[PDB]
CSV table of C-alpha atoms and ligand atoms in Angstrom, one decimal:
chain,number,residue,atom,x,y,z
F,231,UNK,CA,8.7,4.2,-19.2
F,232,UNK,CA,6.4,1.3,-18.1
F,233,UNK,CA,3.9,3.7,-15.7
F,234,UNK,CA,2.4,1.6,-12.9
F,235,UNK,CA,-0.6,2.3,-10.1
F,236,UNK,CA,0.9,-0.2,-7.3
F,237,UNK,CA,-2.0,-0.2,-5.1
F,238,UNK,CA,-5.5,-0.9,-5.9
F,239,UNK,CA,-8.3,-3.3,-4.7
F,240,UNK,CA,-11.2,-5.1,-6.1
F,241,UNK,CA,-14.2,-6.6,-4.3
F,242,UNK,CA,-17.3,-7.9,-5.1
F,243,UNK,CA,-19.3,-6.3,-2.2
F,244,UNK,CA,-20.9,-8.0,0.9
F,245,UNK,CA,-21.5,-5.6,3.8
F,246,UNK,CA,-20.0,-7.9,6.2
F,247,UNK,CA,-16.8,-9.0,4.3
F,248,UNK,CA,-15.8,-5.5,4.6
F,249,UNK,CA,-16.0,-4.2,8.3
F,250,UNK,CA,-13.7,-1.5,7.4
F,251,UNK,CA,-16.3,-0.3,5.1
F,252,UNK,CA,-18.3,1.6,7.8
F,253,UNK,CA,-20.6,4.4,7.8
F,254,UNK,CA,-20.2,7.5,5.9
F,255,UNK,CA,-18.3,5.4,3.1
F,256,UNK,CA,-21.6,4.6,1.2
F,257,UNK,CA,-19.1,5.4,-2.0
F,258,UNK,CA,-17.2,2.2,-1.5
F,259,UNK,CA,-20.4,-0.1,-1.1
F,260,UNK,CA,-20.8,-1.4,-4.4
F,261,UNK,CA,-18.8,-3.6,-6.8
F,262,UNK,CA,-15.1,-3.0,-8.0
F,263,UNK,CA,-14.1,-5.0,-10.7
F,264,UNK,CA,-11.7,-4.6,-13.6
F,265,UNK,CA,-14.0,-3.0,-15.8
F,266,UNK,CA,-14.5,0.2,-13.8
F,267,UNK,CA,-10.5,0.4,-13.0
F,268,UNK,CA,-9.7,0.6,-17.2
F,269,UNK,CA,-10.6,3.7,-18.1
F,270,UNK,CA,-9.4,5.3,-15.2
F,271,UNK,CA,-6.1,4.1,-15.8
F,272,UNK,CA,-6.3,4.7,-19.4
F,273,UNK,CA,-6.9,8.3,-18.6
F,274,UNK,CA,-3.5,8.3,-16.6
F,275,UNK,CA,-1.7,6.9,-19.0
F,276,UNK,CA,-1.0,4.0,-16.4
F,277,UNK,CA,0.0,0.7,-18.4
F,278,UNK,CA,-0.7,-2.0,-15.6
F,279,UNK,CA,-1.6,-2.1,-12.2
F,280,UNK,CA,-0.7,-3.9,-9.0
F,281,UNK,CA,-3.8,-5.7,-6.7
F,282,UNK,CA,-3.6,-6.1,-3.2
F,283,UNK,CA,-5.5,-8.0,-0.8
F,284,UNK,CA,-8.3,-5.9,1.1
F,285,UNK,CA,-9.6,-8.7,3.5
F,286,UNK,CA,-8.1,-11.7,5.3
F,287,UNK,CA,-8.2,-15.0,3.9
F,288,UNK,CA,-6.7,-17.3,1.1
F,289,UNK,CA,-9.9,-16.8,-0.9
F,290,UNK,CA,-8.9,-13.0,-1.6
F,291,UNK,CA,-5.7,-14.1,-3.3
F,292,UNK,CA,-7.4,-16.9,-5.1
F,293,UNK,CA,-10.0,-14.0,-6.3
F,294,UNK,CA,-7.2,-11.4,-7.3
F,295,UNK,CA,-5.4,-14.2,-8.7
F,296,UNK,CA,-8.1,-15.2,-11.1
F,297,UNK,CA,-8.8,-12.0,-12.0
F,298,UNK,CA,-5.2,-11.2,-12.9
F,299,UNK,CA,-5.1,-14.3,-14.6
F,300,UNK,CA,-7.5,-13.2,-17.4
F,301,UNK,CA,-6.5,-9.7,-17.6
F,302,UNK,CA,-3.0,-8.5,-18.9
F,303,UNK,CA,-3.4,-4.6,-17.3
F,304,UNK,CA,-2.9,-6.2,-13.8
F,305,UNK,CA,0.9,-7.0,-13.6
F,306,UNK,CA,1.2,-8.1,-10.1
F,307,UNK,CA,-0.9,-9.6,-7.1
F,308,UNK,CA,-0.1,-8.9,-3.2
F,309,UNK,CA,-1.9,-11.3,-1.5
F,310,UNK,CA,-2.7,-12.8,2.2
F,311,UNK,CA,-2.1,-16.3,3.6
F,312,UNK,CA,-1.4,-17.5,7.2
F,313,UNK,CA,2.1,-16.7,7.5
F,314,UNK,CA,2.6,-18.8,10.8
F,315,UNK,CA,1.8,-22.1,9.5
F,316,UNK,CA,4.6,-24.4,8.7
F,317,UNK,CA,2.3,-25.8,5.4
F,318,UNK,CA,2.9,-22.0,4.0
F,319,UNK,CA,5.5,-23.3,1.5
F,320,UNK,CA,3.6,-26.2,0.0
F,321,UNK,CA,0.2,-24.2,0.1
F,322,UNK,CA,2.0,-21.1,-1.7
F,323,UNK,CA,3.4,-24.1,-4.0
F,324,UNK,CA,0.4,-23.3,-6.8
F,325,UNK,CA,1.3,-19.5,-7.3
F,326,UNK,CA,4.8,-19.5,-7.8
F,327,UNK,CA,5.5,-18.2,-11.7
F,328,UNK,CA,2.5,-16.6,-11.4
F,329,UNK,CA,1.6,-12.3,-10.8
F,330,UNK,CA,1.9,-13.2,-7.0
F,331,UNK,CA,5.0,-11.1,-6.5
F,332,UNK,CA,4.1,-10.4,-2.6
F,333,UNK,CA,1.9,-10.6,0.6
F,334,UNK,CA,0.5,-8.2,2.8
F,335,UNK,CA,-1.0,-9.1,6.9
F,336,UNK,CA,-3.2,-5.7,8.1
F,337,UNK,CA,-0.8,-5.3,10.6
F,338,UNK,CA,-2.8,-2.2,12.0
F,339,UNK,CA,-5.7,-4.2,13.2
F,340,UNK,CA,-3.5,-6.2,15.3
F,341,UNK,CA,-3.8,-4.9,19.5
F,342,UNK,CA,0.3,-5.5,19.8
F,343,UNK,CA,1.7,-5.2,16.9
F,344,UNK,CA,5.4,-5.5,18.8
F,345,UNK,CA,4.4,-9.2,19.7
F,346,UNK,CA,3.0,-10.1,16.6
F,347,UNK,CA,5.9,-9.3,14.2
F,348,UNK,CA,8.1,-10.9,16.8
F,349,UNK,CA,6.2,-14.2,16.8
F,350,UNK,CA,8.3,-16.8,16.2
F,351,UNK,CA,5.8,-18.6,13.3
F,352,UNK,CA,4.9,-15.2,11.9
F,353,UNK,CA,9.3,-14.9,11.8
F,354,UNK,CA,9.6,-17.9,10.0
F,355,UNK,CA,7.5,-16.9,7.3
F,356,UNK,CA,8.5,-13.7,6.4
F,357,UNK,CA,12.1,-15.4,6.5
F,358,UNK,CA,10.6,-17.9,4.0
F,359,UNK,CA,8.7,-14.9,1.8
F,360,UNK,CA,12.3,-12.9,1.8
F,361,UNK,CA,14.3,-16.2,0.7
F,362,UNK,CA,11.8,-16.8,-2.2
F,363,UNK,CA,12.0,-13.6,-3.3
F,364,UNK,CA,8.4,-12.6,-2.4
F,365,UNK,CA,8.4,-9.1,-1.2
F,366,UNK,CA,6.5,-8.1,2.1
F,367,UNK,CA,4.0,-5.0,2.5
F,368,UNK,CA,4.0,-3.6,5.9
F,369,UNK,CA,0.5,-1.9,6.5
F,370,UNK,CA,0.1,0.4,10.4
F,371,UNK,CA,-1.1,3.6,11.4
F,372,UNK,CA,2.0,6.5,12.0
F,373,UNK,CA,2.4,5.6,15.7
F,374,UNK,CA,2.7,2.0,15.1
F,375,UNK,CA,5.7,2.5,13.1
F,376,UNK,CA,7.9,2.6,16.2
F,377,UNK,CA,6.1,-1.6,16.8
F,378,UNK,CA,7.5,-2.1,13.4
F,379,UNK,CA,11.3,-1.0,13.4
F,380,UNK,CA,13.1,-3.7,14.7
F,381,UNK,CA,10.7,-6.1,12.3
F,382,UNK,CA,12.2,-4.4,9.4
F,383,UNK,CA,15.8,-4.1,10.4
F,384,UNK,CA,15.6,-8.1,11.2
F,385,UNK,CA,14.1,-9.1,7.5
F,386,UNK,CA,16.5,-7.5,5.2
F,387,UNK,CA,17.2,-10.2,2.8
F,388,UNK,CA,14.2,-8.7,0.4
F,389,UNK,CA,12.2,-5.4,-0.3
F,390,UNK,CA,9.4,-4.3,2.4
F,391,UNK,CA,7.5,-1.5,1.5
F,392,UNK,CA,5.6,0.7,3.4
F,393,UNK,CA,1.9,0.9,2.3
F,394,UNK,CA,0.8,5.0,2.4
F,395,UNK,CA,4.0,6.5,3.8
F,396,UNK,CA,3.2,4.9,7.0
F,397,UNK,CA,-0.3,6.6,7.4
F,398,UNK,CA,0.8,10.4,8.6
F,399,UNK,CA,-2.0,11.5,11.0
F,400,UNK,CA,-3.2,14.3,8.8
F,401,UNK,CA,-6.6,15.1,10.6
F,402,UNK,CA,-4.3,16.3,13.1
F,403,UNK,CA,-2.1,18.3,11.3
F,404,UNK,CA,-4.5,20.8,11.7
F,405,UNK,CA,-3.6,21.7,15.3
F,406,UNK,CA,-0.5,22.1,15.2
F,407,UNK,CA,3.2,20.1,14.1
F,408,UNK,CA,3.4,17.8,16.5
F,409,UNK,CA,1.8,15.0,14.4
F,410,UNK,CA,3.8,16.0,11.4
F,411,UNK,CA,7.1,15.9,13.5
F,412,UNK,CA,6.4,12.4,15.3
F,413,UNK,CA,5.3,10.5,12.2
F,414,UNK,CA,8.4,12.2,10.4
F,415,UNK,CA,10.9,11.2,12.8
F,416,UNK,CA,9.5,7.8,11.9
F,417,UNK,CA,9.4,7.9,8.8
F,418,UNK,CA,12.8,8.3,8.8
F,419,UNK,CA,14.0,5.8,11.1
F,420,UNK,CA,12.9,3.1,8.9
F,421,UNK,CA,13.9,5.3,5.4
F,422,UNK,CA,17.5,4.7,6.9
F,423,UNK,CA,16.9,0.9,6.0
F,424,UNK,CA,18.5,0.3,2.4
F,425,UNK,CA,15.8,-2.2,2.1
F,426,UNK,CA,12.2,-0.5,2.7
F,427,UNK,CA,10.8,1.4,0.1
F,428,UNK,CA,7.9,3.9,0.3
F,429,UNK,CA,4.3,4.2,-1.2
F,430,UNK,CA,3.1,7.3,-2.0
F,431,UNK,CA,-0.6,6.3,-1.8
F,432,UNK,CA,-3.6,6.4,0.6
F,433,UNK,CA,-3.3,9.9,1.9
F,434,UNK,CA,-6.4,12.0,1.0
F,435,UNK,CA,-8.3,9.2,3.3
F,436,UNK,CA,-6.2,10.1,6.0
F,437,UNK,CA,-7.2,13.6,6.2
F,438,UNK,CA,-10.5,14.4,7.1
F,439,UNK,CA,-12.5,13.6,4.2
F,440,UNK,CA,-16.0,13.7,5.8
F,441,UNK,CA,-16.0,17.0,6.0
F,442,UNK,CA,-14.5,17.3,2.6
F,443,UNK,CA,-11.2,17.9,1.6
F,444,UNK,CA,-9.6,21.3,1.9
F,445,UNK,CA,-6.5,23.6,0.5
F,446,UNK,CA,-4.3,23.1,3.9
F,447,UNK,CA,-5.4,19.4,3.0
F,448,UNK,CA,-3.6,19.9,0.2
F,449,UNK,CA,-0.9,21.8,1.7
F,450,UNK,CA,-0.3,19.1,4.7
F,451,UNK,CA,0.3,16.5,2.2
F,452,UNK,CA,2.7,18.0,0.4
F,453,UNK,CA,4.7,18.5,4.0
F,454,UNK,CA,4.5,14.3,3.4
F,455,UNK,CA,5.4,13.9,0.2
F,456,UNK,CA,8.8,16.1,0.4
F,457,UNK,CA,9.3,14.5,3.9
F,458,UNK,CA,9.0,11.1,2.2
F,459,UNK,CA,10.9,12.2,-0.7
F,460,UNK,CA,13.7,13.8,1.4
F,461,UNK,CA,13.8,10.2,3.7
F,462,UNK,CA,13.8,7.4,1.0
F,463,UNK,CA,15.3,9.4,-2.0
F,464,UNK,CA,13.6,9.7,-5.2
F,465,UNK,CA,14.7,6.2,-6.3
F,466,UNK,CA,12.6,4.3,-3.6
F,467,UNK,CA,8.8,6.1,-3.9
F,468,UNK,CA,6.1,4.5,-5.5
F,469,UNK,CA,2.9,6.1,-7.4
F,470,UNK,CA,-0.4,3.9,-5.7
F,471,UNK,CA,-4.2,5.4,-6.3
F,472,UNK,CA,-5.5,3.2,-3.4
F,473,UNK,CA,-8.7,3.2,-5.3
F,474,UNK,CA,-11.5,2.6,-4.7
F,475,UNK,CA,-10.8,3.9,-1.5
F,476,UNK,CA,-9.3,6.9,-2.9
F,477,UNK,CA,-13.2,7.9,-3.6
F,478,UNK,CA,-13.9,8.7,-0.1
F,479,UNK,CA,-11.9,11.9,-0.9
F,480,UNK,CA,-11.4,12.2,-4.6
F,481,UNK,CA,-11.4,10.8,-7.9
F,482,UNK,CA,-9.1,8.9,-9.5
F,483,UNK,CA,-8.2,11.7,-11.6
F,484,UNK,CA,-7.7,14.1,-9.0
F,485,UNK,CA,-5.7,11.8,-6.7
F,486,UNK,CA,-3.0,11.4,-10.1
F,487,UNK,CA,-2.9,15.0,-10.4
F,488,UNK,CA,-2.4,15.8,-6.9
F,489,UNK,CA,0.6,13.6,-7.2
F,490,UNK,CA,1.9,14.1,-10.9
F,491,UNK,CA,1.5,18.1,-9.7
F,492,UNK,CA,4.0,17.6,-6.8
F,493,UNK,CA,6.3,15.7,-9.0
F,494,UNK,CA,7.0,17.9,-12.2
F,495,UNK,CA,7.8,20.7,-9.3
F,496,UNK,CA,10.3,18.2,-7.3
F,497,UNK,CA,11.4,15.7,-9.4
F,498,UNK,CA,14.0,15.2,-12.5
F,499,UNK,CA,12.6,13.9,-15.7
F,500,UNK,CA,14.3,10.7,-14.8
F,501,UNK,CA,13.2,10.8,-11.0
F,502,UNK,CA,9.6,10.8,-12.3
F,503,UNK,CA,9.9,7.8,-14.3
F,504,UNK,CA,10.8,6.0,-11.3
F,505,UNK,CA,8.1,7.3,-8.9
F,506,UNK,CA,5.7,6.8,-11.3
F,507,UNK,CA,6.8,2.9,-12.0
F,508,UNK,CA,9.9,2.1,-12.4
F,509,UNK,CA,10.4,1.8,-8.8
F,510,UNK,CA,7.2,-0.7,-8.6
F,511,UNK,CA,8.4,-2.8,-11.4
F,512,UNK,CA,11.8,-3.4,-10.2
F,513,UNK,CA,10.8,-4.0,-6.6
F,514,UNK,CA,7.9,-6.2,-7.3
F,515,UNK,CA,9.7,-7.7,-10.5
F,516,UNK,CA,7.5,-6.7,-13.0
F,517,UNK,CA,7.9,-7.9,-16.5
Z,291,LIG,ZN1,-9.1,-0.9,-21.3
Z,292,LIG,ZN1,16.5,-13.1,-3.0
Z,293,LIG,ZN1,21.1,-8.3,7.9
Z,294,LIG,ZN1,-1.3,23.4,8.6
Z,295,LIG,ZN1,18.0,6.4,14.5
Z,296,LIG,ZN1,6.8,21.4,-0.4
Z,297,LIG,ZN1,-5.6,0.3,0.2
């Protein structure tokens, strides 16, 4: 019954560490340490929780490591290194036995994401990540996902999951179901791979949350959620909070209830148990 939030971030705050942390998103400016995530978690019933880089650089997973190291609530660290450099297997050397269980590039931010994945030093380290057992997070927005395909069918020998269900285009949902259809079709091109598992995270930030969130907000991700859960299966779907991000759009609270909401009204007993992290723990290898 071990319950699991798989995606969440820390940071000690500096404006310019965090580009992505833009205007409008004064919420996220400050601190986010271990202290603040406890009782949120506790409130959930959520046992342990898994911390993933949210900038570039071997320093993050040195800071997440730390900070898993002294507390027992984080089970697992995905973290970021140069994935291209031949010294990766010696300069990963340090972590292995400890809550590293994966890494994660911001493959979105890349201008050809095609050519990137197919780089021949990028290859050779994902190769090297899969043969170790490391798993892979694969992080783009919805019409990237076709860049990403072939990547995923090639490295099969370990578990890729796809952070926030690929990133639907829910601002746009609004118009009509073009952007629901495309991102679907998607969706389930890479769902057909035995191998890539889906998180159920980061999708109240994807709507339009500036203008505050709304009931077809509501409505349009559930279209997600039962198009993710009719893709993957209920065996391969993964609670995350993405918090703090989450608070751009809602609080930790509500983002659990949105989910655990959808769930009772979808999902077996059993199915739940899964979704809510058994599915994490046996993909990431969690104790
Ligand atoms: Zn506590
Ligand atoms: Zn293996
Ligand atoms: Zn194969
Ligand atoms: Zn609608
Ligand atoms: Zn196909
Ligand atoms: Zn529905
Ligand atoms: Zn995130």
């Amino acid at each position: 019954a071990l319950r699991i939030d798989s995606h969440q971030h820390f940071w000690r705050y500096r404006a310019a560490d965090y580009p992505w942390i833009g205007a409008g998103m004064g919420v996220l400016a400050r601190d986010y340490l271990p202290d603040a995530l406890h009782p949120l978690m506790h409130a959930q019933a959520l046992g342990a929780s898994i911390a993933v880089q949210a900038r570039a650089g071997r320093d993050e997973t040195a800071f997440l490591l730390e900070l898993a190291c002294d507390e027992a609530r984080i089970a697992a660290v995905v973290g970021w290194e140069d994935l291209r450099a031949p010294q990766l297997a010696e300069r990963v050397a340090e972590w292995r036995g400890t809550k590293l269980r994966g890494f994660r590039h911001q493959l979105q931010d890349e201008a050809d994401v095609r050519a990137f994945v197919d780089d021949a030093d990028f290859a050779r380290g994902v190769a090297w990540l899969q043969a170790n057992d490391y798993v892979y997070d694969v992080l783009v927005f919805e019409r990237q996902l076709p860049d990403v395909q072939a990547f995923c069918a090639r490295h099969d020998a370990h578990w890729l999951v796809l952070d926030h269900a690929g990133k639907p285009a829910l601002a746009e949902f609004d118009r009509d179901d073009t952007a629901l259809a495309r991102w679907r079709a998607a969706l389930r091109e890479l769902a057909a791979l035995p191998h890539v598992v889906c998180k159920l995270s980061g999708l109240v930030t994807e709507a339009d949350w500036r203008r505050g969130l709304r009931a077809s907000d509501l409505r349009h991700i559930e279209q997600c959620l039962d198009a993710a859960l009719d893709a993957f299966g209920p065996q391969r779907l993964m609670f995350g909070s993405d918090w703090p991000v989450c608070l751009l759009a809602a609080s930790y609270d509500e983002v659990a209830s949105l989910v655990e909401r959808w769930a009772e009204s979808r999902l077996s007993a059993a199915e739940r148990s899964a979704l809510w992290g058994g599915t994490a723990a046996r993909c990431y290898a969690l104790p």
